[PDB]
Amino acid sequence: VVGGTRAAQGEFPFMVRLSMGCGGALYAQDIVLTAAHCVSGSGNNTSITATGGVVDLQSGAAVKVRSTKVLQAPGYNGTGKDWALIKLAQPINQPTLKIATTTAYNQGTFTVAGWGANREGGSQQRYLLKANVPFVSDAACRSAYGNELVANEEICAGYPDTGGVDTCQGDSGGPMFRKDNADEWIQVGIVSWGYGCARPGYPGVYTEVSTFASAIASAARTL
Ligand SMILES: [Ca+2]
Numbered sequence: 001v002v003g004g005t006r007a008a009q010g011e012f013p014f015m016v017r018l019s020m021g022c023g024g025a026l027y028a029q030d031i032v033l034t035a036a037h038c039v040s041g042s043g044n045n046t047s048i049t050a051t052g053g054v055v056d057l058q059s060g061a062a063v064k065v066r067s068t069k070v071l072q073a074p075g076y077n078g079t080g081k082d083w084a085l086i087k088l089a090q091p092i093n094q095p096t097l098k099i100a101t102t103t104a105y106n107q108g109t110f111t112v113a114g115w116g117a118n119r120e121g122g123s124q125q126r127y128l129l130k131a132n133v134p135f136v137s138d139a140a141c142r143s144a145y146g147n148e149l150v151a152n153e154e155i156c157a158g159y160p161d162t163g164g165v166d167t168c169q170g171d172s173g174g175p176m177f178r179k180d181n182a183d184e185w186i187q188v189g190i191v192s193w194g195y196g197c198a199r200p201g202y203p204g205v206y207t208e209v210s211t212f213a214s215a216i217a218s219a220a221r222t223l
Pocket of ligand 1: 138155
């Protein structure tokens with residue numbers, strides 16, 4: 001996260017750090033929702049580690065659990081459909097994060113969090129950083145990315161005018177969230193891609209969770 005600040009221990013307890021260098025959110029206590037590009041494909045896999053319960057990755061309080069299976073979005077090919085579920089060997093006993101099933105919240109100011117670089121080509125962070133980034137319409141985002149944007153599957157956020165605050169390398173797979181009408185956190189995006197980090201005219205692109213909600217809920221049931 002570029003232009004970020006330290007999140008407090010316990011602020012976003014649903015966050016997990018994945019061993020390949022991606023963030024994730026606890027969809028279920030033993031199911032991590034992350035990006036498709038963080039994994040190589042679906043199947044049994046006990047090679048991933050999820051670190052949950054701490055803002056400080058070096059914390060002795062860290063909970064580290066191994067995966068058992070991975071379900072990448074069917075047909076992922078690098079264009080859209082940027083989501084995957086990771087089944088854990090054991091539950092991480094922390095609050096989960098609800099996902100958006102409608103588009104009612106795909107607007108306003110979102111919060112992003114991660115242990116990714118705080119600058120282009122910078123290094124991974126020890127402590128979880130957070131930032132607020134505003135929604136950018138598909139049209140304004142398209143004015144920047146052209147045909148690379150899959151409007152129905154992607155939601156943009158950031159400051160088109162000045163840049164300055166954004167997600168960056170290593171933040172991928174992390175949730176982009178905000179409060180719902182019940183003042184509960186709700187997941188509207190997955191960190192997916194962008195050109196550079198925090199540059200004027202290039203907002204961050206995120207998986208538009210509302211589009212894939214049903215697909216995700218169903219896959220989660222079979223895991
Ligand atoms: Ca969109």
